Design a protein around this ligand. Structure first.
Ligand SMILES: Nc1ncnc2c1ncn2[C@@H]1O[C@H](COP(=O)(O)OP(=O)(O)OC[C@H]2O[C@@H](O)[C@H](O)[C@@H]2O)[C@@H](O)[C@H]1O
Lengths: 89, 89
């Protein structure tokens, strides 16, 4: 539809600017190791980042300007260097 | 047998399933209502205990003649006597 602002803005190029948002999920265990329980469903854990000048938690997702290292474009400094390519595999 | 409402763990889970039809008991519904009232030891329940307690609650709420709830009317909070008399009759 319409947004109200003509132009490119702070985005890279026109149209879509393609990016990949990976998410990691795992279960939340009790002191015993069994799954903690809600009223009906269960408890889930995600791994999130907080940047020093974002004041917010967000997903470690990067712009898909590089091919496979776009999660590394989110998480080269975050995850690893060589084992990062292994986890990318 | 008269059960008293608003009292404790087993009393509430019997009193909730009082006027329900006998086929409407689901083994999911049993552990659902169980783990909220047994919230201290809710994780200590296994499936065999759930099916045993479901069978017992089924065979109890079948015989609707021999059971009564106190209902915890709580506006007069009259006596046990008004409950015990109807549970006699
Ligand atoms: N979907 C969104 N929801 C909320 N805020 C957003 C979103 N997308 C972008 N922003 C905000 O827009 C601002 C500019 O976007 P980018 O800088 O392109 O986003 P990013 O590169 O992921 O963040 C860079 C981070 O580095 C710090 O220097 C800066 O404080 C920023 O938090 C950022 O502060 C970011 O918080």
């Amino acid at each position: 539809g319409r947004t109200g602002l003509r132009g490119r803005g702070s985005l890279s190029c026109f149209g879509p600017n393609h990016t990949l948002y990976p998410m990691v999920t795992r279960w939340r265990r009790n002191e015993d190791g069994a799954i903690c329980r809600k009223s009906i469903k269960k408890m889930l854990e995600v791994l999130v980042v907080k940047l020093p000048l974002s004041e917010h938690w967000a997903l470690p997702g990067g712009s898909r300007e590089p091919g496979e290292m776009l999660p590394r474009k989110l998480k080269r400094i975050l995850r690893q260097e060589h084992w990062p390519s292994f986890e990318n595999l | 047998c008269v059960v008293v409402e608003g009292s404790g763990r087993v009393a509430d889970v019997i009193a909730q399933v009082a006027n329900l039809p006998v086929s409407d008991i689901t083994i999911s519904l049993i552990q659902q209502k169980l783990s909220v009232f047994f919230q201290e030891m809710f994780e200590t329940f296994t499936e065999s205990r759930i099916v045993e307690w479901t069978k017992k609650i089924q065979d109890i709420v079948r015989r609707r003649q021999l059971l009564t709830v106190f209902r915890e009317g709580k506006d007069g909070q009259q006596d046990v006597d008004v409950a015990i008399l109807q549970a006699l009759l």
